[PDB]
Paper text:
A subset of [name] proteins bind to [name] ([name]), and their expression correlates with development of the symptoms of severe malaria.
The starting model for the designed immunogen contained residues N648 to K678 from the HB3var03 CIDRα1.4 domain inserted in between residues Gly70 and Asp103 of the three-helical bundle. These residues were replaced with cysteine to form three mutants, cys1, cys2, and cys3, each of which had a single disulfide bond. The cys2 variant was most effective, retaining α-helicity at up to 70°C in circular dichroism measurements and interacting with [name] with a slow off-rate, reminiscent of the CIDRα1-[name] interaction. As determined by surface plasmon resonance, the cys2 variant bound to [name] with an affinity of 26 nM, which compares well with 220 nM for the D576A K642A mutant of this domain, which shares the same number of [name]-binding residues as cys2. We next determined the crystal structure of the synthetic binder in complex with [name]. Surprisingly, a cycle of refinement and model building revealed the presence of a single copy of the synthetic binder, with the asymmetric unit containing a complex of [name] bound to a synthetic binder, together with a second, unliganded, copy of [name]. The structure also revealed that the synthetic binder bound to [name] with the same binding mode as the HB3var03 CIDRα1 domain.
Residue numbers in the entry:
A (entry chain B): 9 to 177
B (entry chain A): 1 to 34, 47 to 119
Write the structure that this text describes.
């Protein structure tokens, strides 16, 4: 079946964000995320992962949230963002009944409207907006600039996420 | 100049945790140049490891936050950011070895 993740980031200003999110494995809620930039707390509702494994998963997730906020700050200092704003990140992996060819995704919405999405075939981010703006071109420029935002993001989706589905259904 | 300011903050943390690590190394040298003192070793092993972890987490948090500011500078890149991050991680580790060594010797 599948692993879907939702992340909602509330920016009052460039310096501070409030996170709210959840994850659902095979249609069941499994994880919850809540808190501000400094103290964002991530908990698993079921003991799917052993304490050591889960601690490594949290380290990874917590590093992502620092990095994510950093990118928002850069886009703002370079192209100026209009605050307050809300960023929705909907991502996951879906496994077929037969075959290993898994469908994977990462769609980003800003203030309820489509913004950018990841395309795993070439590990490149694309615009989901009809509007041509400095913010969209710059964000995509940065997103397609690094191995972190490209092959590492794809590896999370195609390997980390998929393996989790295979292990914990 | 954003990243310039942020490197200064990274430096401060390391410089603080360095002087905190030597505050402990001198405690471990005054107790070896001397059973109960042997527990003064567990208390030094504990305070030293707890200190390391804090130092390692606060500094990594700094690096992860300055991912795009440092790599967007132009004469710094992903490889060099990951290089610098490990260069600092191993700088902290080194001090723990300095302390632990004293204890293991005095054993
Ligand atoms: C199977 C997973 C584990 C099971 C647990 C499930 C999760 C439990 C928590 C529930 C809540 C879920 C919500 C969190 C969202 C997803 C977080 C994961 C993202 C992540 O770590 O991806 C890394 C990439 O990060 C980066 O690339 C960092 C930079 C940030 C990119 C931002 C992308 C959107 C751009 C829009 C922002 C700009 C705004 C402009 C107006 C990959 O790394 P990995 O190390 O994990 O890889 C493994 C290979 N070793
Ligand atoms: C993870 O947290 C989510 C918080 O946003 C939430 O998922 C969905 O979020 C949207 C808000 O953007 C809401 O969607 C709509 O749901 C019903 C349709 O059934 C509408 O009548 C509502 O007016 C609302 O706009 C909901 O809050 C929620 N969606 C649903 C279907 O409940 C969930 O709490 C978490 N995700 C899951 C899948 O449980
Ligand atoms: C994301 O959604 C936000 C909520 O809809 C929106 O915030 C609102 O932003 C505008 C402009 O920055 C603020 O209004 C200002 O502009 C009008 C123009 O006629 C002036 O008359 C007002 O005096 C005022 O200065 C709103 O105050 C602000 N809303 C809140 C709750 O503060 C963001 O702009 C949206 N951001 C993006 C990037 O789309
Ligand atoms: C940890 O983060 C939060 C907010 O800064 C603090 O703890 C609580 O965590 C919940 C998470 O849902 C918050 O909504 C609450 O506002 C917090 N307080 C209570 C009474 O529940 C906590 O103080 C932070 N810790 C540190 C050390 O800063």
């Amino acid at each position: 079946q599948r692993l879907h993740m939702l992340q909602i980031s509330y920016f009052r200003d460039p310096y501070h964000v409030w996170y709210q999110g959840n994850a659902s494995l095979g249609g069941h809620l499994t994880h919850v995320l809540e808190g501000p930039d400094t103290n964002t707390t991530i908990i698993q509702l079921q003991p799917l992962q052993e304490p050591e494994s889960w601690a490594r998963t949290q380290s990874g997730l917590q590093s992502y949230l620092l990095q994510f906020h950093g990118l928002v700050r850069l886009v703002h200092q370079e192209r100026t963002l209009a605050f307050p704003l809300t960023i929705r990140c909907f991502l996951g992996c879906e496994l077929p009944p037969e075959g290993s060819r898994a469908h994977v995704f990462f769609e980003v919405a800003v203030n309820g409207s489509s913004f950018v999405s990841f395309r795993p075939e070439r590990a490149l981010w694309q615009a989901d907006t009809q509007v041509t703006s400095g913010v969209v071109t710059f964000t995509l420029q940065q997103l397609n600039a690094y191995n972190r935002t490209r092959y590492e993001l794809r590896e999370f989706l195609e390997d980390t996420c998929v393996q989790y589905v295979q292990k914990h259904i | 100049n954003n990243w310039e300011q942020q490197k200064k903050n990274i430096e401060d943390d390391l410089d603080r945790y360095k002087k905190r690590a030597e505050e402990l190394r001198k405690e471990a040298e005054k107790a070896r140049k001397e059973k109960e003192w042997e527990k003064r070793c567990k208390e030094l092993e504990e305070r030293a490891r707890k200190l390391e972890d804090e130092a390692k987490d606060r500094v990594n948090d700094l690096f992860d936050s300055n991912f795009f500011q440092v790599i967007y500078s132009g004469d710094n890149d992903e490889e060099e950011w990951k290089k610098e991050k490990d260069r600092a991680e191993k700088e902290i580790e080194e001090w723990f070895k300095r302390i632990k060594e004293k204890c293991e010797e005095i054993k």
